[PDB]
Amino acid sequence: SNTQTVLPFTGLNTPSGVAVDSAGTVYVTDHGNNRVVKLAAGSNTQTVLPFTGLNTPSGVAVDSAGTVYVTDHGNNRVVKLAAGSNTQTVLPFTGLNTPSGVAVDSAGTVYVTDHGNNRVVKLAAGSNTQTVLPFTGLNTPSGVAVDSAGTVYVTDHGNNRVVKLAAGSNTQTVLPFTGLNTPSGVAVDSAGTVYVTDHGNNRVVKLAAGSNTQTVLPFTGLNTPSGVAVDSAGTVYVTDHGNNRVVKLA
Amino acid sequence: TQTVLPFTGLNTPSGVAVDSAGTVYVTDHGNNRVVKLAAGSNTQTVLPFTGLNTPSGVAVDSAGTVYVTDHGNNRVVKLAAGSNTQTVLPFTGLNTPSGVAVDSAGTVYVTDHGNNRVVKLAAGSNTQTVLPFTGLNTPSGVAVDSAGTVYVTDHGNNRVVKLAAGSNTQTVLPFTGLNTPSGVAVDSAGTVYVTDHGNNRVVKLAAGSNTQTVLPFTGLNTPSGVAVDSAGTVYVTDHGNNRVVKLAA
Ligand SMILES: [Cu+2]
Ligand SMILES: [Cu+2]
Ligand SMILES: [Cu+2]
Ligand SMILES: [Cu+2]
Ligand SMILES: [Cu+2]
Ligand SMILES: [Cu+2]
Ligand SMILES: [K+]
Ligand SMILES: [K+]
Ligand SMILES: [K+]
Ligand SMILES: [K+]
Ligand SMILES: [K+]
Ligand SMILES: [K+]
């Protein structure tokens, strides 16, 4: 499909991240409004999630159990909200400096890009101490994604590249993306396709698994894309920072 | 023709400033430090600032005193030129501040970006005052001219807003085609310079004029800050290229 639609979100001020669950519900972090809103599939009235004390929400992720994870830029913390609960929980991350992205794998492990510390940290389910991923040369990590094989994908803002790291591997590889200008967000589907928002180019590129030729998705009117998500049906959701809107493309 | 300044080891720089002596100050944001370069020099010096957390803004007054926006620590640090005396300005309730500026009277203006407001502190004062701006949306840059008029980049509204001294009625500068602007600077002749960050260009608007001009910059990649000296020379931080570019004007 080459025709995008604008999700009926209202009152958006600088959308920063986007996530989608199994039921099609789209979660969006509202940077300028210090809130996280969600919109059910087909619905037109968004609801505000019962988060408390948010300061510049930068990234969002949702697991299979409906738990919503949010990186709090202004508070240097990561909070989570279980399904049906109205009491958030601050994950026991430490030493965070401007958390920019969040991802959760099949085992419940939470991955967080540490913008100010040039590192990616992860926290196993129920663990109290974090571990640092063996990435090297990261310049301002901005986004993170993890596929079904445990491979972690990270957008290198300051290096205009996307690096990946297989599970249990200490050798990182640079994805064959071309012409990248300030990558901001990253997402990967169950088929291995990597989707990356190009902040400096106002475009969204994708790269199939094992491919060396990227493809620019036919999004229109993009102004500073900040986040990207992909659902079960392959629809790509993109937060339009400059336009205060969220678009989707089938 | 433009000139690249011999700065070394820059990592995602944000702010830029220049004093009367032509010394250029830049905020090395990715290195949590502020370095300066004297006019005609190629050896930079690191300012004695300490504990900076993701700093963004930088300004310099007549006496050479340097002000930096400690963005990650929600404060503004002052460094006197005479002694090594450092002082955290008594600002209150700051939330992710971005811009900083200072006028001839020593009043420091800081863009409280997270609160969509601009607050000022008089020289030697402990009580801050919120400027009567209305409808600011994620503002980034702030500047002040000789007459005390405060200029702010309404980054979320893609516009530049000014407010005269004593004025409580703001006016929108007739800029066109702005896309997520970041920095603002003001010269002696009342010319406002704005970094069109989303367009990789630097635009300017003379006093009273309603149409703008684009500065002949080349190879700009996501610019952040802008500064102007006495001779009209424009300095811009090529943030995406980790460099500071000078254009004689
Ligand atoms: Cu950058
Ligand atoms: Cu940074
Ligand atoms: Cu910040
Ligand atoms: Cu903001
Ligand atoms: Cu913006
Ligand atoms: Cu940008
Ligand atoms: K954003
Ligand atoms: K953000
Ligand atoms: K961020
Ligand atoms: K970021
Ligand atoms: K980014
Ligand atoms: K962005």
Side-chain angles (χ1 to χ4, degrees), chain A residues 1 3-250, chain B residues 1-83 85-209 211-249:
Chain A
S1 158
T3 83
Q4 78 188 19
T5 70
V6 180
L7 290 184
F9 281 106
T10 50
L12 288 197
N13 198 327
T14 312
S16 47
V18 60
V20 64
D21 62 359
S22 55
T25 303
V26 180
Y27 309 85
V28 170
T29 46
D30 216 353
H31 176 146
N33 288 325
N34 297 319
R35 64 172 183 174
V36 180
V37 298
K38 72 178 184 174
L39 192 58
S43 166
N44 84 311
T45 57
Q46 83 213 1
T47 74
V48 184
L49 275 75
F51 283 111
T52 53
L54 289 192
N55 193 337
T56 310
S58 52
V60 66
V62 54
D63 61 6
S64 56
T67 304
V68 176
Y69 308 77
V70 171
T71 50
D72 220 358
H73 175 149
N75 285 325
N76 292 312
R77 66 174 190 180
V78 184
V79 301
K80 71 170 176 182
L81 200 46
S85 171
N86 281 70
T87 297
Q88 73 188 13
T89 292
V90 180
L91 291 176
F93 284 106
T94 51
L96 289 190
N97 196 342
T98 314
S100 54
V102 56
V104 183
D105 62 2
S106 55
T109 305
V110 183
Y111 306 81
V112 174
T113 41
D114 216 1
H115 173 146
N117 288 322
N118 290 328
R119 62 174 190 179
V120 182
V121 300
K122 72 179 180 181
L123 187 68
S127 167
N128 276 344
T129 178
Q130 71 191 24
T131 58
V132 185
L133 275 76
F135 283 110
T136 52
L138 289 190
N139 199 335
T140 310
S142 60
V144 65
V146 50
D147 60 359
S148 56
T151 302
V152 185
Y153 308 85
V154 173
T155 45
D156 219 358
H157 175 140
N159 288 326
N160 296 316
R161 60 172 187 181
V162 183
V163 301
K164 81 172 170 182
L165 198 58
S169 168
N170 287 37
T171 308
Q172 79 181 29
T173 60
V174 176
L175 270 67
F177 283 114
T178 56
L180 279 198
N181 198 10
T182 313
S184 50
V186 65
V188 59
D189 58 4
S190 51
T193 302
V194 175
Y195 307 77
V196 170
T197 49
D198 219 0
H199 180 148
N201 291 323
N202 302 309
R203 62 170 185 176
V204 180
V205 298
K206 72 170 174 179
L207 181 78
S211 172
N212 294 267
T213 292
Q214 77 189 25
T215 294
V216 181
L217 287 181
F219 284 104
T220 54
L222 280 195
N223 184 14
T224 309
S226 55
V228 59
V230 182
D231 65 351
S232 56
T235 304
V236 177
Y237 303 80
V238 171
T239 42
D240 217 357
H241 174 155
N243 292 319
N244 292 325
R245 62 172 185 177
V246 182
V247 304
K248 72 178 189 179
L249 187 79
Chain B
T1 83
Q2 60 177 44
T3 317
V4 183
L5 273 56
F7 283 107
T8 82
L10 291 192
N11 188 281
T12 69
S14 48
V16 68
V18 55
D19 57 6
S20 57
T23 304
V24 183
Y25 307 84
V26 65
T27 299
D28 205 7
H29 164 92
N31 287 320
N32 298 309
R33 64 176 190 177
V34 179
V35 316
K36 75 179 198 178
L37 184 72
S41 194
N42 40 72
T43 58
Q44 71 190 29
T45 47
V46 175
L47 266 62
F49 281 128
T50 278
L52 293 184
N53 192 304
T54 55
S56 37
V58 62
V60 62
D61 62 356
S62 50
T65 291
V66 182
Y67 308 88
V68 63
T69 296
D70 203 0
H71 165 96
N73 290 330
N74 295 306
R75 61 186 181 182
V76 171
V77 192
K78 168 212 289 192
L79 172 70
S83 169
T85 299
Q86 299 188 38
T87 308
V88 176
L89 293 191
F91 286 110
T92 50
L94 290 194
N95 193 10
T96 62
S98 57
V100 71
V102 58
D103 57 3
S104 54
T107 308
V108 183
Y109 310 86
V110 55
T111 292
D112 202 8
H113 159 93
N115 287 315
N116 298 312
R117 62 172 189 182
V118 174
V119 63
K120 68 180 181 180
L121 255 178
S125 167
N126 290 320
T127 75
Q128 68 179 21
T129 292
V130 182
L131 271 69
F133 278 108
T134 50
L136 289 184
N137 195 292
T138 55
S140 48
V142 68
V144 51
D145 56 3
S146 96
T149 300
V150 176
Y151 307 82
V152 64
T153 46
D154 209 1
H155 159 94
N157 286 321
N158 289 330
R159 65 182 178 184
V160 186
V161 182
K162 85 178 189 179
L163 185 63
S167 207
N168 284 23
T169 316
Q170 68 186 43
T171 62
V172 175
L173 269 61
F175 280 106
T176 40
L178 285 191
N179 185 246
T180 59
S182 51
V184 66
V186 282
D187 67 351
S188 56
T191 302
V192 177
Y193 302 79
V194 186
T195 51
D196 206 355
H197 166 93
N199 289 326
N200 303 307
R201 68 177 186 179
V202 177
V203 303
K204 72 158 176 175
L205 190 81
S209 174
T211 36
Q212 51 170 74
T213 75
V214 184
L215 273 70
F217 277 106
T218 185
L220 257 54
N221 185 285
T222 68
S224 154
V226 62
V228 184
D229 61 359
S230 56
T233 299
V234 179
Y235 309 85
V236 68
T237 38
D238 207 5
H239 161 94
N241 290 321
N242 301 308
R243 73 183 180 177
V244 184
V245 181
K246 154 167 63 183
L247 186 62

Short mmCIF file of all heavy atoms in Angstrom, two decimals, chain A residues 14 31-32 56, chain B residues 96 113-114 138, ligand 4:
data_model
loop_
_atom_site.label_atom_id
_atom_site.label_comp_id
_atom_site.label_asym_id
_atom_site.label_seq_id
_atom_site.Cartn_x
_atom_site.Cartn_y
_atom_site.Cartn_z
N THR A 14 4.20 16.94 20.08
CA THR A 14 5.48 16.28 19.85
C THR A 14 5.41 14.80 20.20
O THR A 14 5.95 14.38 21.24
CB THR A 14 6.59 16.97 20.65
OG1 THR A 14 6.51 18.39 20.46
CG2 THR A 14 7.96 16.48 20.22
N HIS A 31 5.47 13.61 24.24
CA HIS A 31 6.59 14.36 24.80
C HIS A 31 6.11 15.67 25.42
O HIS A 31 6.33 15.93 26.61
CB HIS A 31 7.63 14.59 23.70
CG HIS A 31 8.80 15.44 24.10
ND1 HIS A 31 10.07 15.22 23.59
CD2 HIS A 31 8.91 16.52 24.91
CE1 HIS A 31 10.90 16.12 24.08
NE2 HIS A 31 10.22 16.91 24.89
N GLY A 32 5.45 16.51 24.62
CA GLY A 32 5.06 17.83 25.07
C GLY A 32 3.96 17.85 26.12
O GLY A 32 3.74 18.91 26.72
N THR A 56 8.73 14.24 30.09
CA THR A 56 9.21 14.01 28.73
C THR A 56 9.27 12.51 28.42
O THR A 56 10.36 11.93 28.38
CB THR A 56 10.58 14.65 28.52
OG1 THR A 56 10.54 16.01 28.97
CG2 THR A 56 10.98 14.62 27.06
N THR B 96 14.14 20.77 32.06
CA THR B 96 14.81 20.60 30.77
C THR B 96 15.06 21.92 30.04
O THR B 96 14.59 22.11 28.92
CB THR B 96 14.03 19.64 29.89
OG1 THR B 96 12.72 20.17 29.62
CG2 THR B 96 13.88 18.28 30.57
N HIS B 113 12.32 25.16 28.77
CA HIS B 113 11.69 24.45 27.66
C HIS B 113 10.59 23.52 28.15
O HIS B 113 9.49 23.48 27.57
CB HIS B 113 12.76 23.68 26.88
CG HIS B 113 12.22 22.55 26.06
ND1 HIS B 113 11.88 22.70 24.73
CD2 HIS B 113 11.99 21.26 26.36
CE1 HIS B 113 11.45 21.54 24.26
NE2 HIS B 113 11.50 20.65 25.23
N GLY B 114 10.85 22.76 29.21
CA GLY B 114 9.87 21.82 29.72
C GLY B 114 8.63 22.48 30.31
O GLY B 114 7.60 21.82 30.45
N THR B 138 7.24 24.21 23.33
CA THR B 138 8.58 23.61 23.36
C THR B 138 9.64 24.59 22.85
O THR B 138 10.32 24.31 21.85
CB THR B 138 8.61 22.31 22.57
OG1 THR B 138 8.13 22.53 21.24
CG2 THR B 138 7.75 21.25 23.24
CU CU C 4 10.76 18.85 24.92
#
